[PDB]
């Protein structure tokens, strides 16, 4: 509308600090911040979510289970949005690889913690014999 893209200069310095490839030297550019935001609108997702780190958390979650269904276009997004969330959490990644994994690995740890409380609910009755 009247203004596109949030991340200001002071913040951009961090966005342009993230690499694109694992063993490459390419970095991120505004072009990507927009190329992604312009996708959310079509992905039934509000572009005002990328403004906050929390907003992205909800986005990646939706595209997560779609990483398989969606086409190559859905893959390029996850790799991008992943770099953003890290920038907002004051987290510095090494590239589009360490970034995506840094988020994918975090979901694996939460999965166990989410299905661990069930134990406290279940009946805990131990028993041991002796001579
Ligand atoms: C006019 O109303 C267009 C509104 C454009 C949406 C703002 C872009 C979202 C902020 C930047 C996205 C960050 C992705 C790395």
From Swiss-Prot:
Lineage: superkingdom: Viruses
Stretches the record annotates as Disordered: 105-127
Membrane topology term: Lipid-anchor
Result, substituting residue 8 to A: Loss of ability to fuse with target cell membranes and infect host cell
Sequence motif Nuclear localization signal, location on chain: 25-31
Region Interaction with host AP3D1: start-end pairs: 11-18
UniProt region (Interaction with host CALM1), positions on chain: 7-42
Residue ranges annotated as motif Nuclear export signal: 15-21
Record region (Interaction with membrane phosphatidylinositol 4,5-bisphosphate): 72-76
Outcome reported for the amino acid change (mutating residue 66 to A): Loss of ability to fuse with target cell membranes and infect host cell
Residues recorded with modification Phosphotyrosine: 131
N-myristoyl glycine lipid attachment residues: 1
Region (Interaction with membrane phosphatidylinositol 4,5-bisphosphate and RNA): 13-32
Spans annotated as Interaction with Gp41: 6-30
Assembly behavior: Homotrimer; further assembles as hexamers of trimers. Matrix protein p17: Interacts with gp41 (via C-terminus). Interacts with host CALM1; this interaction induces a conformational change in the Matrix protein, triggering exposure of the myristate group. Interacts with host AP3D1; this interaction allows the polyprotein trafficking to multivesicular bodies during virus assembly. Part of the pre-integration complex (PIC) which is composed of viral genome, matrix protein, Vpr and integrase.
General function of this protein: Targets the polyprotein to the plasma membrane via a multipartite membrane-binding signal, that includes its myristoylated N-terminus. Matrix protein is part of the pre-integration complex. Implicated in the release from host cell mediated by Vpu. Binds to RNA.
Protein name per the record: Matrix protein p17
Organism listed in the record: Human immunodeficiency virus type 1 group M subtype B (isolate NY5)
Range covered out of full length: 2 to 132 of 1435
């Amino acid at each position: 509308g009247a203004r596109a893209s949030v991340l200001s200069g002071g913040e951009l310095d961090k966005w342009e600090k993230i690499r694109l490839r694992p063993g490459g030297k390419k970095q991120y550019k505004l072009k990507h911040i927009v190329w992604a935001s312009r996708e959310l609108e079509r992905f039934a997702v509000n572009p005002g979510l990328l403004e906050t780190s929390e907003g992205c958390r909800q986005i990646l979650g939706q595209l997560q289970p779609s990483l398989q269904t969606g086409s190559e276009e859905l893959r390029s997004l996850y790799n991008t949005i992943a770099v953003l969330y890290c920038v907002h959490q004051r987290i510095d990644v090494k590239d589009t690889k360490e970034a995506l994994d840094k988020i994918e690995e975090e979901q694996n740890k939460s999965k166990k913690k989410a299905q661990q409380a069930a134990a406290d609910t279940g009946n805990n009755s131990q028993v041991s014999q002796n001579y």
